């Protein structure tokens, strides 16, 4: 289970994207008994918050999910080669953390919500 | 809720496969307060581990999920009639528990991972 955990942390983002399951399997498992229980409960609700974020987009039960949100060059103007073959995910997170909330807001604002409503309507004709 | 729980435990696997929801609904609900809380938390994280296993395959939100992993006759060389009309799920688990981890590894090794990557690529053309 723990084997290979974060082993691709220094890999390129393209190469680290083939190991997502090792880092996804590892997110789910007196006063000190209460401490351990608090840790376990916190891990559970954190995992559920991440899954809820994935589910309010179209990305439920998926480790890679393509969306309908266009990429804005105000967030990053690098070409795919610099991102997926020259950079790592930690560097990318450092670069893109200032816009992450804007991206999340756009992911749940229009694309999944208007998509869902449009599929509600396309199931009428 | 509890009605019919494990009632098809002695049924054939084919017949017990029509009652999966009674056994799926029943997996989710001082020092003794801590004991009850530990039990509840353990049940929650166990359920979430099972759902994570289903989701890293293509089986998210499904009680029956068809896959792209071929069956190997090194795991069981019985024909469908012996399995789904003559055997029960407990006997099948006793027979197949030695290979279960190999099957799980194959389920998350290539089929869902390469499928997902191929759907990443088919969403380009």
């Amino acid at each position: 289970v723990f084997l290979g955990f974060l082993g691709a942390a220094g890999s390129t983002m393209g190469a680290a994207s083939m190991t997502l399951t090792v880092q996804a399997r590892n997110l789910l498992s007196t006063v000190w008994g209460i401490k351990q229980l608090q840790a376990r409960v916190l891990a559970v609700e954190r995992y559920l918050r991440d899954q809820q974020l994935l589910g309010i987009w179209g990305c439920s039960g998926k480790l890679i999910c393509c969306t309908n949100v266009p990429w804005n060059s105000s967030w990053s103007n690098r070409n795919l080669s610099e991102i997926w073959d020259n950079m790592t995910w930690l560097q990318w997170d450092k670069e893109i953390s200032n816009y992450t909330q804007i991206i999340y807001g756009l992911l749940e604002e229009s694309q999944n919500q208007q998509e869902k409503n449009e599929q509600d309507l396309l199931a009428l004709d | 809720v509890f009605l019919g729980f494990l009632g098809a435990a002695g049924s054939t696997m084919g017949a017990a496969s029509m009652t999966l929801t009674v056994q799926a609904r029943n997996l989710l609900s001082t020092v003794w307060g801590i004991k009850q809380l530990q039990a509840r938390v353990l049940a929650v994280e166990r359920y979430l581990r099972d759902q994570q296993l289903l989701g890293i395959w293509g089986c998210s939100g499904k009680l029956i999920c068809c896959t792209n992993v071929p069956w190997n006759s090194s795991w069981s060389n019985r024909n469908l009639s012996e399995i789904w009309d003559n055997m029960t799920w407990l006997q099948w688990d006793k027979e197949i528990s030695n290979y279960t981890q190999i099957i799980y590894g194959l389920l998350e090794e290539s089929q869902n991972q390469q499928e997902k990557n191929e759907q990443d690529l088919l969403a380009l053309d």
Partner: antibody
Amino acid sequence: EVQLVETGGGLVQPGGSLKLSCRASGYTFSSFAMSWVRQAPGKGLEWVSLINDRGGLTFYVDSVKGRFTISRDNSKNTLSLQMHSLRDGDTAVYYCATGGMSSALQSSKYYFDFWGQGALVTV
Amino acid sequence: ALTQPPSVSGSPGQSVTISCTGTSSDIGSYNYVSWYQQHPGKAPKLMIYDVTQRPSGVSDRFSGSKSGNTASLTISGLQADDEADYYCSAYAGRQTFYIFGGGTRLTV
């Protein structure tokens, strides 16, 4: 430095079968989508088939959809094209080329960058 | 298929333009039009990709452009080596991937 050498072109009776192969060198074979494009002798080029970089996705022109089978081995740096139930319209020089598509993590390569020599198939 | 003139004639020093008419579904929908040069008796060579872009090792004399459903290849400063069959290619979508135009003979 890129080299793509085709082997297996020859004469085959109508209704026969033939396996063309293309050996690649001078570049990362596993990082490129491959394609087979045929030119009949007096006519122009015609796209036959396409395979992605990993070898999991295969596309064919409808004229050879159920008959041809493109495959690749990245360990051996080989690209195979199996041909079954060969008709008279398949007489052509077949070229293996690099391109046709790319991964989602790469720029679009909707073109055939590096071509091979050619392999003559006659029915 | 893509309609292409069977022949285009020129002399050294001038500039010629080979046209390529296609359906709206292929050239009018996607900006992926490419031009190959096949000298007689040898394999094709990519001269232009993505309408305008050039590979490495290709002179500025070869250029490409698009207008609506028609893509054009301009060859300037004609030379002896330019005598070849110039083939059009267009990405026609997911169902039909690539459609090639009829070869055009250049006479210098």
